[PDB]
Design a protein around this nucleic acid. Structure first.
Lengths: 130, 260, 251, 185, 96
RNA sequence: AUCUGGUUGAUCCUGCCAGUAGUCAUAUGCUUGUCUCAAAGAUUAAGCCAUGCAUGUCUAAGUAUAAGCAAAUACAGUGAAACUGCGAAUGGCUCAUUAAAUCAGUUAUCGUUUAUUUGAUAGUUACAUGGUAUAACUGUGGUAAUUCUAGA
RNA sequence: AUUCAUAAUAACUUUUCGAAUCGCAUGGCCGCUGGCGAUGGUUCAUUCAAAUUUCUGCCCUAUCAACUUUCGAUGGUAGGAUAGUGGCCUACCAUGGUUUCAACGGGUAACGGGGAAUAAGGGUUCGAUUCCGGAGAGGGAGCCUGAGAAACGGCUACCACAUCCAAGGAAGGCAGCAGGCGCGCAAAUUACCCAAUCCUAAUUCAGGGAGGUAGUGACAAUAAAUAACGAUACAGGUUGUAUUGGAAUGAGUACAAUGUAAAUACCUUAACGAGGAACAAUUGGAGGGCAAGUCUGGUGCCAGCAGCCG
């Protein structure tokens, strides 16, 4: 059966160049709808580019048939890319996950460096001579 | 403690902010500034919880650092800057102005004002004295010091201040028959007219107030703020005009009228 | 002061070794795979071979261990090795069920002669993997089984996890064992070396563990019966003073 | 730390344990209404105890005392909404005369039996727990749900079940397949 | 909790006639010496000297209970296993 | 807003023992399928502690010749080390001591200090001065050993 | 309510402060003049605070009736010291101060309060512990820096413990988080993360075992499966007792999507998943108190039962 998408409590927000609203979805006879599908259908209704649309926070009603979530649409792809959190941009494929080392290893490195005064090019020579 | 404290646990926050119990362990501690901690409203609480323009503390900072917000005509960027009673807040995008004023329930209301009224604020006179070289000055409730007041100004009077320049333009004497706004205690947010004042030397003076439904009540002089003549406010009043209703009256109005 | 007094016997590199016996309850297991996984947590590859008794020093805990592996062919030999232990390590299989005619009888018998202390261990739990939640179903079943015989114990360790395997090793080093009443009111030693001298004389050296030895008392060896000793010496010498009793059964 | 979560106990135990006359009266209720426990009866008598306590207090106040008017009317309004109190008895003195059977009568389990749909209170309970009954659009699977007077018109089979119009269940489908396989020899 | 010193039988008070089974125990935390009753008949075979036992009060807030003169406590667990489980044959006891 | 069993040959009393219900009161035994929610080395020892972590910080805007990287002849992007400035007196843990002490409500400073925030506020006394100065850096070293540090 | 605010006169001072600083822009007038900001600085006010302070209020004890004043106890005058009041300290002087309306002494398995349990009403018992206030960092003393500390993830000494060593020396403080030993009736992982709440810094960006997430967890609390319905036979006023038949469903497993910092789980869902529905509910009792056996086998005042009567 047809999915029906409705938007509620629409607020325009010039301070962050976006519109923000509640998303309410009817979907009889299917489990739910993917965030990827919602972003495409919201893009055409608000005349936006797909990369400017962000959608999050869904739960489906007990007994099924309905879901509710939250949505944002930005005035441009450039503005979305600066105000949006990085973790969401990764979900959409607009950014790459950074390869930092684990939290405990980073802390242990810091504490070793605290024991060296200066830049340590000296001392390295001194140990080699010992 | 060995010095000043930097944190504020939730539950210890002022109740009129209407923070929920469970969303976190801490609350925003207001910075030092014009208004006392217990009776200020931090900007983060205004933008996030009242207007809903921001979802997070992180987003609030993204707004302020663009310099979109100014208080009494000056740009502020401290997340916990303490706005307070009678202050003017301006958002230039969206083109909106607000004055912070109390509900009859004793909460800060969202009250919009015209671009004209945003020019000025009222101030209660806290003391008047001679400064160095013999120059007189007044101190207002929000901590401004103004040089060379009119010789007739006395304590408990109210003064009209132009936000540009900062000079005094008018004043109203404390007297019987004036309108007053109540700013503390059990009767916070009510409006009425002065009936008479009780002198108590070495103690607290008491003031008798009557509202337009001719109910009467009493408050300490410390809590009284003069705002105009009988029936002529110097500022726009919030919806409901400071008339207190009994819980029975409130129940009827909602379900009978608005509840259709 | 009493707690120090008691721990002194194992105090350090001069102190006595704790005696560990490994007993796999299933023919599947091979006891040397258990010993291997333990020593990986010692963080010293220098610790880690066609023999069945091992001496080890774990510098990480300043601890001395003696490890005994019995030959699982000989039921009577299993009971003998356990009789001298401080800790018995029981190996359980996640794949194959314990046999009533042999595996159970080991446990039941060891209880009834007395046990100094016990640990339950698994080493092959990955062999049933589909997801880790399927492993935990099996582990809960084994804990219920083991607790039937040793109801003081509520946890069975999985040696395939570094944290568990390290947890076992620490226990063997740091914790004092229970006594065995009938054993410790006698003397006993485990032989380090044995040698013969000519009309015969047999020399043994080791470490005393029980109440102690006296050269006027008789000395039992389980397969050979009673014997008499002529000297004690400390590595002062204590000859048999012969104002003593002798190998006779009457009067 | 975060503020504490509040909670409370919702039932009370009788003080004489083996009183023969009480034991019989309770078992008659369980058989008539299809309950599983004595606890389900203790819950209702605990609620009714608090209602009487509140009303009994207000009746000591003067008439036209503002508190008696405000809180008294709210209490009555609330009991009429669920149909526990008749709209003819709309007075604080009749609140004291309520009894346990008046509350049991309003449970979803018994309503689904009075309406038809089910042929015993025991058949009714199974249907609810197995997700066949809906109240308006919402599926409800709790037997102790109290039916408000407006809701009674809207009790029906759920759209996503057999009896309600969906595909047959797992066992019906299995049988048809196996028969077709044998018939599709 | 205490250590079992020795095993005793106590003659019941008249008019009843029975030899009831008890043990001497030394409490670990005090060194004080106490006599405890062992319930459930043949259960006395499960306790032996230098076993460690957990004791509970005999229900009468420091008075002696029934026939038994001067006995104020009962055994609950021995060597870490409960006597009720042993008596019903639900667990097994290791020796030491 | 409720009680019942036990002193006698039998009775009415005084009186206690036992029974009965709860506990955001702890421990322990037997048993244990589902959803929401949730305390947790206080009691005895404010006893003793292996190992790792829990406090640092830069903007257009104090100091750059890294012999760093990346590509307007005094300099001009990015940026390690070090100097300078601010912070480390908040937070988190525990309950040993303490009986007009701490604490609660209510007062006072005409009896005193106050980084920071906010508002006011100094015509009155060379087209720009020193090293009575040094870190990082370069280079030569001591000690089994530490966030040791010397001479140039 | 003032010897208040403030002003004036004569001097003092080892002489306080009164811009030798930084970014962006490049306008006006015939080499002179100019804008928007950052950081510093004197004094007054304000804000976040601190210190001291008035009145009334506390558990058991007389097998504690007199206590304080040498060596400050109560008060007066002067000085010193302090940010400042005051026996806070010193000199001289006076002889006072508290108490049967319980002083002083002793005990507390005593941190205070908001509060908790049980209540017809009046009461009794508890509060180490999520918020507010106080104290401490093995035990005592002393002190540097600073607006603020008598700081302990700062220093110095002594007392008690205790680590490394080449034996000359060096280093130490988990009543922070996780973890170990001991103790005992008695209490969890040497895991993931700054996404949320907020805090600090020269700061939108860095950091945070504060805090959040998951693991262990029958402390306490809420909802709630373990079966429903026909036919046949027999009995009975539509209800019982036993041969037989189709339907319904989640416990569990799982493609997927959702959830989330990334995950696990909940909510949703294709496929699979009941006939001893083995997909088998326990814990205590059956003389009385106190719901419920004149049943049947065993045993020998013993083994045992028994809160009490037995």
């Amino acid at each position: 059966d047809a999915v029906t998408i409705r938007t509620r409590k629409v607020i325009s927000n010039p301070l962050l160049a976006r519109k923000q609203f509640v998303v309410d979805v009817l979907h009889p006879n299917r489990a739910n709808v993917s965030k990827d599908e919602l972003r495409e259908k919201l893009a055409e209704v608000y005349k936006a580019e797909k990369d400017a649309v962000s959608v999050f926070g869904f739960r489906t009603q007990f007994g099924g048939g309905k879901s509710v979530g939250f949505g944002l649409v930005y005035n441009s792809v450039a503005e979305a890319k600066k105000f949006e959190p990085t973790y969401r941009l990764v979900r959409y494929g607009l950014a790459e996950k950074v390869e930092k080392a684990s939290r405990q290893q980073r802390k242990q490195k810091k504490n070793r460096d605290k024991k060296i005064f200066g830049t340590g090019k000296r001392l390295a020579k001194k140990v080699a001579r010992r | 403690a060995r010095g000043p404290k930097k944190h504020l646990k939730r539950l210890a926050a002022p109740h009129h902010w209407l923070l929920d119990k469970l969303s976190g362990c801490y609350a925003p501690r207001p910075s030092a500034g014009p208004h006392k901690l217990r009776e200020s409203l931090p900007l983060i609480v205004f933008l996030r919880n009242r207007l809903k323009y921001a979802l997070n503390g992180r987003e609030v900072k993204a707004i302020l650092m663009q310099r979109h917000v100014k208080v009494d005509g000056k740009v502020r960027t401290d997340t916990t800057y303490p706005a307070g009673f009678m202050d003017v807040i301006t958002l230039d995008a969206t083109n909106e102005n607000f004055r912070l004023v109390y509900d009859v329930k004793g909460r800060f209301a969202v009250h919009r004002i015209t671009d004209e009224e945003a020019s000025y604020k009222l101030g209660k006179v806290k003391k008047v004295q001679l400064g160095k070289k013999g120059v007189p000055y007044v101190v207002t409730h929000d901590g401004r010091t103004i040089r060379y007041p009119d010789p007739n100004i006395k304590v408990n009077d109210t003064v009209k201040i132009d936000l540009a320049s900062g000079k005094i333009t008018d004043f109203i004497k404390f007297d019987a028959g004036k309108l007053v706004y109540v700013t503390g205690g059990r009767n916070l947010g009510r409006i009425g007219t002065i009936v008479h004042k009780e002198r108590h030397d070495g103690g607290f003076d008491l003031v008798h107030i009557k509202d337009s439904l001719d109910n009467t009540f009493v408050t300490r002089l410390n809590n009284v703020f003069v705002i105009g003549e009988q029936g002529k406010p110097y500022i726009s009043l919030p919806k409901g005009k400071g008339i207190k209703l009994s819980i029975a009256e409130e129940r009827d109005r909602r379900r009978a009228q608005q509840g259709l | 002061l009493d707690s120090i007094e008691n721990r002194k016997l194992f105090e350090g590199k001069n102190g006595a070794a704790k005696i560990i016996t490994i007993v796999p309850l299933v023919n599947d297991l091979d006891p040397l795979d258990i010993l291997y996984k333990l020593l990986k947590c010692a963080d010293d590859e220098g610790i880690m071979d066609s023999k069945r008794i091992f001496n080890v020093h774990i510098k990480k805990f300043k601890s001395n261990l003696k490890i005994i592996i019995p030959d699982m062919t000989n039921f009577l030999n299993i009971l003998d090795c356990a009789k001298v232990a401080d800790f018995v390590v029981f190996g359980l299989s996640g794949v194959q069920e314990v046999d009533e005619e042999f595996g159970e009888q080991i446990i039941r018998a060891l209880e009834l002669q007395g046990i100094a202390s016990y640990i339950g261990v698994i080493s092959n739990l990955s062999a049933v993997h589909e997801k880790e939640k399927f492993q935990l179903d099996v582990k809960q079943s084994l804990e219920s089984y083991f607790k039937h015989f040793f109801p003081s114990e509520e946890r069975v360790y999985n040696l395939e996890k570094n944290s568990d395997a390290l947890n076992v090793l620490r226990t063997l080093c740091q914790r004092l064992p229970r006594s065995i009443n009938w054993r410790d009111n006698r003397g006993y030693v485990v032989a380090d070396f044995v040698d013969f001298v000519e009309s015969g004389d047999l020399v043994i050296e080791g470490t005393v563990r029980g109440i102690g030895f006296n050269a006027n008392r008789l000395v039992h060896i389980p397969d050979f019966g009673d014997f008499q000793l002529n000297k004690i010496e400390k590595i002062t010498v204590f000859e048999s003073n012969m104002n003593r009793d002798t190998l006779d059964e009457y009067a | 730390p975060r503020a504490p979560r509040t909670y409370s106990k919702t039932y009370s135990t009788p003080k004489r344990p083996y009183e023969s006359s009480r034991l019989d009266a309770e078992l008659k209720l369980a058989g008539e209404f299809g309950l599983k426990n004595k606890k389900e009866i203790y819950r209702i008598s605990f609620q009714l105890s608090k209602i009487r306590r509140a009303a009994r207090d207000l009746l000591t106040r003067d008439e036209k005392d503002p508190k008696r008017l405000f809180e008294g009317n709210a209490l009555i309004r609330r009991l009429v909404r669920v149909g526990v109190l008749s709209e003819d008895k709309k007075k604080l003195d009749y609140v004291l005369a309520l009894k346990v059977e008046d509350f049991l009568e309003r449970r979803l389990q018994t309503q689904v039996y009075k309406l038809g749909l089910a042929k015993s209170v025991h058949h009714a309970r199974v249907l609810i727990t197995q997700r066949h009954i809906a109240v308006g659009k919402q599926i409800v699977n709790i037997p102790s749900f109290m039916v408000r007077l407006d809701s009674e018109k809207h009790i029906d089979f759920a759209p996503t079940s057999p009896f309600g119009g969906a595909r047959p269940g797992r066992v019906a489908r299995r049988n048809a397949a196996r028969k077709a396989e044998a018939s599709g020899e | 909790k205490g250590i079992v010193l020795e095993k005793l039988g106590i003659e019941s008070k008249q008019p009843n006639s029975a030899i009831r089974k008890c043990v001497r125990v030394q409490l670990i935390k005090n060194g004080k010496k106490v006599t405890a009753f062992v319930p459930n008949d043949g259960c006395l075979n499960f306790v032996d000297e230098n076993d460690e036992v957990l004791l509970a009060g005999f229900g009468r807030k420091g008075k002696a209970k029934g026939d038994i003169p001067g006995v104020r406590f009962k055994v609950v667990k021995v060597s870490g296993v409960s006597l009720l489980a042993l008596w019903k044959e639900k667990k097994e006891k290791p020796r030491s």
